[PDB]
């Protein structure tokens, strides 16, 4: 069905009413979201079907209809925008300077914005509007707030 580039909501009619489980990005005919949103299950777009193509539970990412297309990276210096798509609320851009997640395998950018779990999959953008990652996989800090990593896949 709908194949236009842009940000989309991922919904389900399995629970009470219509519930938003997450968000995703459509780009170059490929739908990109986080694994914990769909659990790798197939999606419906109008009257069409989107089948998974690639996924990895450790990276917490999944791509539909084709391989991962998003290849932009945070430069380690500039502020970025979280194009948040919250449940039952309109798309809203929020600008912030990312922090860092120091791991044994390298540093990763991290946005200190807190949004419901239904917001998972919302894109994070650079100055030219390119998608540098997805929001939704992070940690709960001392003061109870959520801090998400900037999660980016690999483009082959």
């Amino acid at each position: 069905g709908e194949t236009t580039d842009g940000v989309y909501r991922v919904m389900t009619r399995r629970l009470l009413g219509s519930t938003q489980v997450g968000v995703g990005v459509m780009q170059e005919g490929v739908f990109h979201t986080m694994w914990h949103v769909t659990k790798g299950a197939a999606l419906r777009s109008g009257e069409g079907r989107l089948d998974p193509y690639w996924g990895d539970v450790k990276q917490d990412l999944v791509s539909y209809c084709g391989p991962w297309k998003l290849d932009a990276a945070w430069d380690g210096l500039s502020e970025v925008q979280l194009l948040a798509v919250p449940p039952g609320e309109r798309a809203k851009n929020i600008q912030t300077l990312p922090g860092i997640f120091k791991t044994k395998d390298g540093d990763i950018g991290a946005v200190a914005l807190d949004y419901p779990a239904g917001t998972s999959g919302s894109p994070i953008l650079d100055k030219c509007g390119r998608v540098i990652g997805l929001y939704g996989n992070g940690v709960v800090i001392k003061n109870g707030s959520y801090v998400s990593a900037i999660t980016q896949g690999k483009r082959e």
């Binding site: 236009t4 842009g6 940000v7 999606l43 851009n93 922090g99 395998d105 200190a112 992070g138 940690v139």
Partner: protein, 39 residues
Amino acid sequence: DMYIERAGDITWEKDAEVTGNSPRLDVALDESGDFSLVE
């Protein structure tokens, strides 16, 4: 059955709400894709 609905264009918006801090956190990623605080 999960379904998708369009929510908007992906663009940088000038003069957006500027909020949020920049913390440097020591973390670990487990085999199931879960992050945890290392202190």
